[PDB]
Amino acid sequence: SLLEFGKMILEETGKLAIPSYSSYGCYCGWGGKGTPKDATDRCCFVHDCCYGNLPDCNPKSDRYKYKRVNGAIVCEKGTSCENRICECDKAAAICFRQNLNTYSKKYMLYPDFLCKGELKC
Amino acid sequence: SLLEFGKMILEETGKLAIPSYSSYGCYCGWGGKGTPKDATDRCCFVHDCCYGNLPDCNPKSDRYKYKRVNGAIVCEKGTSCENRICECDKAAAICFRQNLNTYSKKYMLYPDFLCKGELKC
Numbered sequence: 001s002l003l004e005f006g007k008m009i010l011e012e013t014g015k016l017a018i019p020s021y022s023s024y025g026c027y028c029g030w031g032g033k034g035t036p037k038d039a040t041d042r043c044c045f046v047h048d049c050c051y052g053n054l055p056d057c058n059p060k061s062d063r064y065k066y067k068r069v070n071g072a073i074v075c076e077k078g079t080s081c082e083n084r085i086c087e088c089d090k091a092a093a094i095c096f097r098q099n100l101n102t103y104s105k106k107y108m109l110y111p112d113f114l115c116k117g118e119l120k121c
Numbered sequence: 122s123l124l125e126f127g128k129m130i131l132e133e134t135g136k137l138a139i140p141s142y143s144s145y146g147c148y149c150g151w152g153g154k155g156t157p158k159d160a161t162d163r164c165c166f167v168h169d170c171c172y173g174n175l176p177d178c179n180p181k182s183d184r185y186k187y188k189r190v191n192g193a194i195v196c197e198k199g200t201s202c203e204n205r206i207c208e209c210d211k212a213a214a215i216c217f218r219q220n221l222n223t224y225s226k227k228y229m230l231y232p233d234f235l236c237k238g239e240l241k242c
């Protein structure tokens with residue numbers, strides 16, 4: 001659920017999910033159109049393709065359990081869904097960190113309007 | 122406070138906080154249930170999600186000051202609360218303007234039974 005995903009992002013990046021990522025670029029803060037603006041934006045994209053491959057699950061709402069082992073995110077075992085969702089969230093969060101040095105305020109509150117077209121996942 | 126938030130709204134969109142954004146979709150207002158129906162509806166979902174990260178404050182009434190600098194909304198300095206509450210509002214009002222394009226009357230006075238899923242933040 002967004003609760004785990006959000007506090008996962010703050011642990012990895014130091015930024016709070018909401019203002020930092022709720023509306024970054026074309027895919028961060030749920031969008032679905034356009035050509036990803038940068039690296040951070042590419043992660044929201046990939047994260048969306050990840051959620052999209054869980055038809056049998058409720059990604060935005062199901063609460064899953066996870067712990068940090070020696071500073072690394074580890075998805076605890078739960079249902080098939082909770083596990084796949086958690087991995088999607090972990091991958092996105094970790095990516096966010098890896099690309100912090102390219103995070104541009106220039107893309108926060110980016111006009112969804114400017115994003116046109118549907119990219120294949 | 123809502124008196125400042127309503128002012129930004131009228132400035133950025135030209136519409137009155139009340140009708141235009143008080144009974145629109147599943148989130149613009151007080152009901153708060155289901156899945157956002159469109160760009161504008163998401164702008165308001167993200168907004169009381171923002172108000173949820175401020176437990177130690179009271180957004181409805183504490184008054185803050187803001188101004189424009191080269192036409193941009195800037196939150197004047199004050200207490201930590203006033204500043205954070207204002208950032209929530211600032212972003213929301215800008216979000217409403219960036220989406221004046223898809224704002225449709227078909228979402229006004231939207232019925233409760235049409236607000237689906239379980240969503241938390």
Ligand SMILES: O=P(O)(O)OC[C@H](O)CO
Nearest residue numbers: 017021022029044047048
């Ligand atoms: O948890 P958020 O609101 O910061 O969202 C990020 C997007 O869902 C990534 O696709």
Ligand SMILES: O=P(O)(O)OC[C@H](O)CO
Nearest residue numbers: 142143149150165168169
């Ligand atoms: O008309 P308002 O000022 O209550 O606007 C939108 C929603 O309340 C935001 O949560």
Ligand code: NA
Nearest residue numbers: 062063064082
């Ligand atoms: Na669960």
